Structure formats: C-alpha cells, structure tokens
Design a protein around this ligand. Structure first.
Ligand code: MLQ
Length: 260
C-alpha cells in the first residue's frame, strides 16, 4: 500500500499497544540483553559459567540442577506470556477453552523465540542478565542433557541474523499465539481474524523498521516452521529422560501441556 491513512494509523496504534504490553510483561528485553552482551556499560557484569569450577562459584549432578533451573524459568516464562496474551486486542473476548488451548500450544514457541534474545555465538544470558552460560559448557553436559539447547542455539543464530527488535518481536509473538491451527479450537474464524490483523501489523512494522532487507516478512513467517520442529524435537527429548532418569520428576503445570 505505502499509504498513511486511517487503516495504517490503527496498525501503528496496535503495534504501540503490543510493544507497551511486552515491556510491562517481559522484564529482560532484547535491547538490554544485546547491551549487556556487547559490553555496553550496563549496570552490572554477569558471571561467566564456562566449566564445572566457574559453575560452582556462580551457583552462589549439575546436569539435573541446570535442567531443573530451566523448568523453573519455563514456569515463570508462561506467567509472562499469559499476561502478554491477555493484552492482545480480542484475546480475552474468546472462549476460555480456546484461550487455554492457544497458550497450551503457543508458550514453547514463544519461549524459544525470547531465549534467542538472550543468546549470541558464545552462550545465553541467565537470571535477568546476572549470569552467562557458554554453549560449549551446555554441550559438555552429561548425555542426554548436552542435547537440549544446542538446537535452540542453531535456531537462534539463524533468527538473530534477521536482527529483529522488541517492537518486531512483540507483534511476532502475538501472531504466534493467535494460531488458527492448534488442536481442539472451538471457534477458529475469530482467532484467524485477529491474526490477519496482527499479520497486517507485522508486515507494516517490518517495512517501516527494516528498509535494507526484503522478504524479511516471509523469512520471519518461515521461522514459525523452525519453531514447530524445535518444540516437536524438544518433546521427544523430554520423552526419553522420563524413561532413563527414573529417579527424578518434572513440575506438574508443564505436564498438563506435555501430553497433547
Ligand atoms: C541458575 C541455573 C541456570 C539456568 C536457568 C535458565 C535461565 S534462561 C533459560 N530459560 C530456558 C527455558 C527453557 C529451556 N529449554 S532448553 O533450552 O531446551 C534446555 C536446555 C538445557 C537443559 Cl539441561 C534443559 C533444557 Cl529444558 C532453556 C532455558 S535457559 C534463567 O534465567 O533462569
């Protein structure tokens, strides 16, 4: 279109609203993370866990302790996403079973999207920017726990190459949540209508925000495929440890989601 009219103004207002919700819902944004990660004289300096010795210092089997850290964080992450979901124009207006469904099947895609914010070539920022854990350390975890994040790193470096900002991600995450094709949705049409509008919002945001890159919209939409594969892969990984590791157990609120 390339026209500043009433429809385009609404799409900006929607972009602004989602951004503001995202800032309120999500405490460590991408902008902060990038700043910390690039040594942009952010308030304090995270402790770098690169081995067993460095981990014991910072922690002021490990494979189990770290795995249980990632489930605890995963739980809070769902709070954050629940709160953001509820800020999306038309969302609370939907059947409760649909709302609950969209989140059942959304939260992991969103989790692995946001985790990319915390990652570079070297590793991931942990506990709101106070720690950094290396990729090679996480790989070196006792099998099969060395296998979990490697694929998220592989996703992230591809994803981070798109160079999206918090304003981009805000709309993107909304688009993901309102996915018409989740199992056992009563009313598809109303969800698809919100997503069509979110997709208009995104296409506009990207055009305005990314002069120097085309088929960014498309390359971004393709990422939703990579996200599905990552979640699928992640589940077949959770499946295996439940057999092998018949000595531990996994937070029940996650178990509700992890059987469908
Ligand atoms: C203090 C212990 C450090 C870990 C805590 C997690 C960090 S951020 C974070 N958040 C999630 C959320 C999900 C995942 N899923 S995952 O990548 O497949 C994964 C990688 C390794 C292991 Cl051992 C298990 C798992 Cl599930 C990982 C992470 S890492 C935080 O701020 O607290």
């Amino acid at each position: 279109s390339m026209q500043l009219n009433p429809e385009s103004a609404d799409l900006r207002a929607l972009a602004k609203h989602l951004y503001d919700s995202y800032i309120k819902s999500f405490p460590l944004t991408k902008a902060k993370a990038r700043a910390i990660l690039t040594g942009k004289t952010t308030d304090k300096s995270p402790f770098v866990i690169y081995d067993m010795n460095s981990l014991m210092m910072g922690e002021d089997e490990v494979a189990i302790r770290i795995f249980q850290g990632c489930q605890f964080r995963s739980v809070e992450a769902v709070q954050e996403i629940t709160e953001y979901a509820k800020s999306i124009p038309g969302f609370v207006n939907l059947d409760l079973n649909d709302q609950v469904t969209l989140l059942k099947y959304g939260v992991h895609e969103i989790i692995y999207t946001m985790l990319a914010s915390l990652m570079n070539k070297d590793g991931v920022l942990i506990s709101e920017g106070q720690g950094f854990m290396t990729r090679e350390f996480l790989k070196s975890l006792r099998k099969p726990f060395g296998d979990f994040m490697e694929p998220k790193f592989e996703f992230a470096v591809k994803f981070n190459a798109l160079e999206l900002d918090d304003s981009d991600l805000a709309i993107f995450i909304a688009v993901i949540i309102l996915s018409g094709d989740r199992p056992g949705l009563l009313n598809v049409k109303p969800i698809e209508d919100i997503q069509d509008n979110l997709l208009q919002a995104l296409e506009l945001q990207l055009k305005l925000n990314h002069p120097e890159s085309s088929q960014l919209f498309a390359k971004l939409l393709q990422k939703m495929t990579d996200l599905r594969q990552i979640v699928t892969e992640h589940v077949q990984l959770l499946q295996v440890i439940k057999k092998t590791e018949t000595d531990m157990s996994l937070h029940p609120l996650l178990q509700e989601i992890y059987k469908d």
